[PDB]
Amino acid sequence: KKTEIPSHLKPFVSTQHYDQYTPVNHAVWRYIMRQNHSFLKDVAHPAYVNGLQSSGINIDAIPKVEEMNECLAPSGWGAVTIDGLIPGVAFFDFQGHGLLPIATDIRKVENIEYTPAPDIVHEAAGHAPILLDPTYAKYVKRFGQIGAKAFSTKEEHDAFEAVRTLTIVKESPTSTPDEVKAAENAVIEKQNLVSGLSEAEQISRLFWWTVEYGLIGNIDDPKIYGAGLLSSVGESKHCLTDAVEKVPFSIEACIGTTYDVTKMQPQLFVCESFEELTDALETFSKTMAFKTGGKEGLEKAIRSENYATAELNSGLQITGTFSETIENDAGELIYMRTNSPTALALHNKQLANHSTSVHSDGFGTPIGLLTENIALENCTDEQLQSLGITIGTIAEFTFASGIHVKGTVTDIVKNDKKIALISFIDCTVTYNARVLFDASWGAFDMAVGSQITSVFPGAADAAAFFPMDEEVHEIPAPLVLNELERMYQTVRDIRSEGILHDAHIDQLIAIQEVLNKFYAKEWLLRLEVLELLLEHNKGHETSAALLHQLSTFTTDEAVTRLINNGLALLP
Numbered sequence: 001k002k003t004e005i006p007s008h009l010k011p012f013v014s015t016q017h018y019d020q021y022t023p024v025n026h027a028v029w030r031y032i033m034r035q036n037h038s039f040l041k042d043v044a045h046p047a048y049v050n051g052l053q054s055s056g057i058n059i060d061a062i063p064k065v066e067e068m069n070e071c072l073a074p075s076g077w078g079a080v081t082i083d084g085l086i087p088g089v090a091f092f093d094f095q096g097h098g099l100l101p102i103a104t105d106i107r108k109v110e111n112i113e114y115t116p117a118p119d120i121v122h123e124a125a126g127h128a129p130i131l132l133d134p135t136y137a138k139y140v141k142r143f144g145q146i147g148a149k150a151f152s153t154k155e156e157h158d159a160f161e162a163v164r165t166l167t168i169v170k171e172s173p174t175s176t177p178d179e180v181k182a183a184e185n186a187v188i189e190k191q192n193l194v195s196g197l198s199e200a201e202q203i204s205r206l207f208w209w210t211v212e213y214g215l216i217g218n219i220d221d222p223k224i225y226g227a228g229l230l231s232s233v234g235e236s237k238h239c240l241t242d243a244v245e246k247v248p249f250s251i252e253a254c255i256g257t258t259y260d261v262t263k264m265q266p267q268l269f270v271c272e273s274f275e276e277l278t279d280a281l282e283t284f285s286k287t288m289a290f291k292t293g294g295k296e297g298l299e300k301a302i303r304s305e306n307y308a309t310a311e312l313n314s315g316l317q318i319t320g321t322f323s324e325t326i327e328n329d330a331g332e333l334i335y336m337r338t339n340s341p342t343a344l345a346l347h348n349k350q351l352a353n354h355s356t357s358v359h360s361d362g363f364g365t366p367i368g369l370l371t372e373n374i375a376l377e378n379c380t381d382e383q384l385q386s387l388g389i390t391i392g393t394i395a396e397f398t399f400a401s402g403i404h405v406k407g408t409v410t411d412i413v414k415n416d417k418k419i420a421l422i423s424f425i426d427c428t429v430t431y432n433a434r435v436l437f438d439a440s441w442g443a444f445d446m447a448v449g450s451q452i453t454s455v456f457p458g459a460a461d462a463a464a465f466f467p468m469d470e471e472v473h474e475i476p477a478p479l480v481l482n483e484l485e486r487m488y489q490t491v492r493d494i495r496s497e498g499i500l501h502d503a504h505i506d507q508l509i510a511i512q513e514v515l516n517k518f519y520a521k522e523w524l525l526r527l528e529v530l531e532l533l534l535e536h537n538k539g540h541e542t543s544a545a546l547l548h549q550l551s552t553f554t555t556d557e558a559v560t561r562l563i564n565n566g567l568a569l570l571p
């Protein structure tokens with residue numbers, strides 16, 4: 001059975017259009033994967049070669065994400081297509097559900113060595129292979145669940161929105177250079193306001209030094225598992241040199257080390273085992289608001305200025321933008337409120353009659369034990385009758401804080417044995433002089449709890465809380481393929497047949513003549529023709545000429561390295 005996509009993450013899911021891959025795109029995939037196989041089979045984690053094949057990824061052509069999804073299903077994993085930049089919490093949430101999110105664009109031939117934007121080479125060929133090791137898949141899935149609970153600052157949310165805006169303007173024909181420059185400046189302004197170390201920044205550093213640039217084994221002879229290294233033979237070769245410091249993995253070093261995506265990594269972190277990473281991630285998770293709860297967790301929710309969920313010891317989950325807290329003389333929290341539409345939930349399921357439409361202007365809740373050391377959450381029906389908490393009865397009780405509640409009880413919502421929500425009408429709630437609830441305001445819904453167990457970003461029932469929009473994407477128009485693309489396709493068609501008859505050899509010589517007359521800088525198609533002739537021991541004169549031309553092709557250092565690496569794989 002295939003891994004299911006949660007309804008809340010369905011809005012981020014797109015479609016891979018295979019017909020948008022040109023013959024050059026398949027050739028670029030093939031060259032990179034052949035180079036990746038040559039070097040990584042000896043220096044990468046042992047799972048890389050069989051893991052790529054078992055993930056549905058082949059060297060000859062770009063992979064289909066739907067095939068990868070079927071291939072990973074026996075491992076309890078899946079693959080989905082995403083279009084454009086998605087929030088970090090969603091990126092991690094997919095992984096927490098055992099789903100690999102893959103952007104399907106491929107890099108241009110001019111950007112084989114470095115792509116400014118991560119492509120299918122990195123997102124499929126880098127992130128999928130080691131998942132075939134169940135210990136690694138366990139770490140990535142657990143990392144996904146923890147990363148989806150990480151709080152970001154309002155400044156980080158603003159910076160992310162501005163970055164998403166720039167990508168839409170930059171990739172649009174209507175946009176002017178000045179319209180782009182403004183979006184570029186908005187990013188610098190928003191990024192400048194970012195300060196401090198959020199849980200999300202720490203999780204981002206941990207993911208980078210493990211899932212992305214991680215090394216495993218003896219520090220003297222480390223093996224590569226990092227997706228960025230598995231997608232870059234150039235970086236993987238440099239990383240194993242003394243030019244890059246190998247440092248033992250630690251949570252402290254990784255969460256405290258910043259990174260630059262533009263330049264090669266100055267240091268890399270070596271783990272002994274995936275079990276070590278999983279244990280360290282769990283130990284780190286205890287510093288996070290989802291595990292801590294309390295005012296410390298709620299403070300992170302307020303700094304986010306974004307939707308968050310507070311879970312009480314009753315199990316009542318409150319989803320909204322938290323805005324204010326009332327603390328006592330000892331700094332202990334006794335009351336909290338939201339300033340936004342709010343929803344209430346039990347067991348990640350929205351309670352009936354407790355949607356955003358009901359709580360449109362905010363939700364306020366006293367938190368603590370009652371007087372006489374009474375935990376209202378664990379109170380029995382008999383104890384509630386003694387307290388006066390019975391439907392149709394005017395209830396009057398005082399919290400240990402001094403918050404005073406008087407109202408006619410309308411409803412009691414229980415979570416199993418525990419009391420979770422007490423609804424009131426004609427209700428007045430007061431703390432000293434301050435009126436926390438006025439009877440003119442109507443219904444008071446009192447969440448029951450003495451402690452805040454967990455604070456996490458987003459919603460407990462995201463499908464109910466958020467609009468699950470079914471976006472419509474237009475199918476892209478069919479590609480028009482020029483002479484060069486057709487020549488690449490012709491070499492691929494001949495290689496697939498596995499026969500090199502006289503007419504096929506004549507076609508290859510015709511292609512070599514077109515390249516000599518009209519395509520002086522075309523090195524990849526020349527390499528593919530040389531590879532094919534050498535494989536079938538045919539066209540001896542054409543092969544010698546192509547080998548000499550490619551060996552002495554250009555003064556350019558990058559292309560020379562790219563050609564020489566291709567020449568190195570020849571029979």
Ligand SMILES: [Fe+3]
Binds near residue numbers: 118122228
């Ligand atoms: Fe990556």
